Amino acid sequence: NDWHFNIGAMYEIENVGLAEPSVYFNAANGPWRIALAYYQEGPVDYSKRGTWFDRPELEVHYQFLENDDFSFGLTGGFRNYGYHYVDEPGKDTANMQRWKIAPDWDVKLTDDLRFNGWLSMYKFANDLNTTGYADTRVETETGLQYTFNETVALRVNYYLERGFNMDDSRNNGEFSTQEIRAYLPLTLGNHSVTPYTRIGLDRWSNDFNRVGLFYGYDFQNGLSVSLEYAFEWQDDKFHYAGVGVNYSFHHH
Numbered sequence: 001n002d003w004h005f006n007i008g009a010m011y012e013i014e015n016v017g018l019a020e021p022s023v024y025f026n027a028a029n030g031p032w033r034i035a036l037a038y039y040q041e042g043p044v045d046y047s048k049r050g051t052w053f054d055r056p057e058l059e060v061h062y063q064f065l066e067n068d069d070f071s072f073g074l075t076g077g078f079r080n081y082g083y084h085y086v087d088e089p090g091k092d093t094a095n096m097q098r099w100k101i102a103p104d105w106d107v108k109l110t111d112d113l114r115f116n117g118w119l120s121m122y123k124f125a126n127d128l129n130t131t132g133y134a135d136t137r138v139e140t141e142t143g144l145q146y147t148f149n150e151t152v153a154l155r156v157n158y159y160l161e162r163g164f165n166m167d168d169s170r171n172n173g174e175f176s177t178q179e180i181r182a183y184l185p186l187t188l189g190n191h192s193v194t195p196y197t198r199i200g201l202d203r204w205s206n207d208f209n210r211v212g213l214f215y216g217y218d219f220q221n222g223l224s225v226s227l228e229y230a231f232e233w234q235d236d237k238f239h240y241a242g243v244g245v246n247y248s249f250h251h252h
């Protein structure tokens, strides 16, 4: 079968502040896909330093079935969160892993309408007292896709993320987030434009909205780039900007 490879890089900025460079490489053959990525997050002014962390990751995806009427796959993943704390009590480092098992599906309802989504089951282990994370988490984004034509499609999804603790007497990091996410994927030749919105339904930890715009360009020579902006707020204003480059090449 054909070996499909991808290599890429991204640089994101989240300021209310954070600089986040990352790279990745993935290979696919038949129903299998293996992805490796490295992500780092720290203050934009780390030069002045402060707490930061890196996030190596290995994911494997398997496609059980891929037909027009029904498609389903599964991804297994592992990540380590390497924290480096600055000017804070306790040890200055911590390592917490995240194990992920997540099915994804796409089911045809009509020639124009589809029901798709994914669901991730997570386990977090080690240094959770320092880290503050709940040891268990479930997340899901599932919904409907109405396709106008090859150029436009509408997607409206329900989103849920929640943290639980298997450890009966520990309530650290527990939370619940529910949202409605709408996207309007536009494909224009080599251009890709996807304006989207996140409508907060409710969230509690221990109304929030976001509007954004994704843009991607494909040079059709294996190279593609992307730019994206997002604005989130409560009453709490946050800004997000990101740029990326991907190079696609196959085998056989």
Ligand SMILES: CCCCCCCCOCCOCCOCCOCCO
Pocket (backbone or CB within 6 Å): 023, 024, 025, 036, 037, 038, 056, 057, 058, 080
């Ligand atoms: C095969 C191509 C790899 C493409 C680069 C992706 C980056 C992969 O991870 C590098 C690991 O970064 C350093 C940390 O020490 C390793 C910890 O174990 C993490 C599991 O991947």
Ligand SMILES: CCCCCCCCOCCOCCOCCOCCO
Pocket (backbone or CB within 6 Å): 154, 156, 180, 182, 183, 184, 195, 196, 197, 199, 200, 201
């Ligand atoms: C930038 C996105 C443009 C895409 C437009 C498609 C809009 C489609 O309809 C979305 C309708 O759903 C709205 C949100 O859910 C209701 C909110 O919850 C109620 C009270 O908080």
